[PDB]
């Protein structure tokens, strides 16, 4: 099994989400530690923004890391993506309420967590990266493009329309400070 010889704790989820996460782990040979225990679990699966963890574990990881491992049939390093460990977000603030964000080169559970962060920070997320606003199509004008690497259809339009194309770390730095981070510090060309 994928998670064979691995023990897990599942914390911070509702009753229904916990069962889905529990069954997913067991279907891949994973072991579930029932608290309280003397077993130091290898992993503690927590929500993206984290939760209270009062038991010593090997690594605290998110549901996004878990689902990414299953989609790729590979035990992915939790340290290879900031979304695989709890994301620090300043609560009570919506610093991106003035933004209209479109994503590119983001697929799967990584995209869903990113869309979760953008909406949690007040932003409006659109599948389209448009020039100007078109009310007749339900589309608003775009303000930011979040891409991983240069090149691509949306990226070439961002340089052409003078709209900021930034890394994912701009979204994460915004979430940590509670203020809209400077796009010039997170441009993709640099």
């Amino acid at each position: 099994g994928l998670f064979s010889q691995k023990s897990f704790l599942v914390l911070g989820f509702s009753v229904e989400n916990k069962c889905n996460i529990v069954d997913i782990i067991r279907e891949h040979a994973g072991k579930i530690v029932s608290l309280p225990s003397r077993i130091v679990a290898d992993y503690a699966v927590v929500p993206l923004l984290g939760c209270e963890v009062d038991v010593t574990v090997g690594e605290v990881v998110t549901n996004t890391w878990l689902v990414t491992c299953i989609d790729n049939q590979t035990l992915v390093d939790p340290k290879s993506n900031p979304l695989f460990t709890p994301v620090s977000v300043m609560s009570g603030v919506t610093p991106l309420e003035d933004c209209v964000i479109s994503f590119s080169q983001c697929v799967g559970a990584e995209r869903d967590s990113l869309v979760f962060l953008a909406n949690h920070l007040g932003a409006s997320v659109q599948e389209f990266f448009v020039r100007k606003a078109n009310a007749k199509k339900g589309m608003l004008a775009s303000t930011h493009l979040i891409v991983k690497e240069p090149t691509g259809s949306k990226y070439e339009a961002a340089k052409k329309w003078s709209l900021p194309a930034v890394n994912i770390s701009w979204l994460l730095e915004t979430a940590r400070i509670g203020k809209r981070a400077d796009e010039n510090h997170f441009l993709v060309d640099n």
């Binding site: 590119s104 080169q105 389209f128 990266f129 448009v130 020039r131 078109n134 691509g152 949306k154």
Partner: peptide
């Protein structure tokens, strides 16, 4: 307006 990637 750039369409979304497939």
């Amino acid at each position: 307006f750039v369409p979304p990637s497939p």
